[model samples]
Target: SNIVMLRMLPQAATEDDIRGQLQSHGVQAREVRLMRNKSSGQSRGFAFVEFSHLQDATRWMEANQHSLNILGQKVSMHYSDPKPKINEDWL
Candidate 1:
């Protein structure tokens, strides 16, 4: 997958901040989505970043799996699942 989920982010973090972080490591992201609470317009402490290529995403994960830090908080990265599993009971 070319999309990665970043958890443990600071609530005040922004997309630009994430972009800067990636750029500092020579990585470019196709998209950056910081999850927010729609009602309060506040961050949910997590975000998703989409890379142009799967290899880039994987490399980014491998290189920073233990050292990526954002806004004084160490963040964790993992591949995102774009698909949502359906429950048979819902049908």
Candidate 2:
């Protein structure tokens, strides 16, 4: 998946905001998503970011492991599980 899950994000954070912040830090995120409540349409205070490679995502996690702050809130990042296989035979 080449993705990282961002937890404890700011309530006001958007995908663009996350992307810009990563860009400022030279991560060059491929895509960003700030989760939202289905009924409220409000931020869930979390996000997901995709990088071009797993090493890129891992580097970002290590660099900002404990210092990632967005809108005054510390954000946590972790690798996501890759997509599931249709069956063990497909692996």
Candidate 3:
């Protein structure tokens, strides 16, 4: 699993509009899910992606940590858990 924090710009801050910011990087809904308002189906200005495997997630983090810009939004990558937001800090 991996966690990528995309500093969604001031433009269209709504979760619905900016949620797909990470998907452009080849991530899928099955692989990564946004942590905020997941049930309501909205973005929380950031994203938490859960890759299929630890290695895959780690590779993505290292390769694109501070390198991806999806729709003018800067994206930072990190490894995350496949489970739900049990960690309150991130939530």
Candidate 4:
């Protein structure tokens, strides 16, 4: 009931970075997972931000969508499905 996808993040962004940024918008994430680049150990420009409840996630995403700049890029938000599958058509 509680995960939202935050995409188009800055390469240097981290869980703490995302947490604090979201906090400033009056929403706190229970946890944050910033996708990492294996070779360089850097952020992969996206994250999964978690809230304790679905309503919190919905409110946060609605409040912040396309409204802030992070590392010279505009970030986007979307609700995540419980199971995300790799589309076979892309293969």
Cα lDDT of model 2 by residue, 2-81, tens digit: 67888888778777777777777688887666754355343677776778776777777777754588888988877666
Clashes of each: 0, 0, 1, 0
Clashing pairs in model 1, backbone N/Cα/C closer than 3 A: none
Task: Please provide the root mean square deviation of candidate 2 (C-alpha atoms, Å).
Answer: 5.0
Provide the lDDT at 24 for model 3.
53
lDDT of 2: 0.72
lDDT of 3 by residue, 1-91 (tens): 4444444433344444333543555544443344455584535555655555455555555657555555566655544445455657445
RMSD values for the candidates in order, in angstroms, are 5.4, 5.0, 5.7, 6.1
Q: Per-residue lDDT for 35-73 in model 4, tens only?
A: 553644335777777786678887777776544566678
Global lDDT of each model?
0.76, 0.72, 0.50, 0.70
What's model 3's lDDT at 76?
A: 57
Candidate with the greatest TM-score versus the true structure: 1
- Deviating ranges (above 4 Å) for candidate 2: 35-42, 83-91
- Show the lowest summed lDDT stretch of 10 residues, model 3: 9-18
**Model 3, runs deviating above 4 Å:** 1-29, 35-42, 80-91
- Segments of candidate 4 deviating more than 4 angstroms: 35-42, 82-91
Ranked by lDDT from best down, the candidates are 1, 2, 4, 3
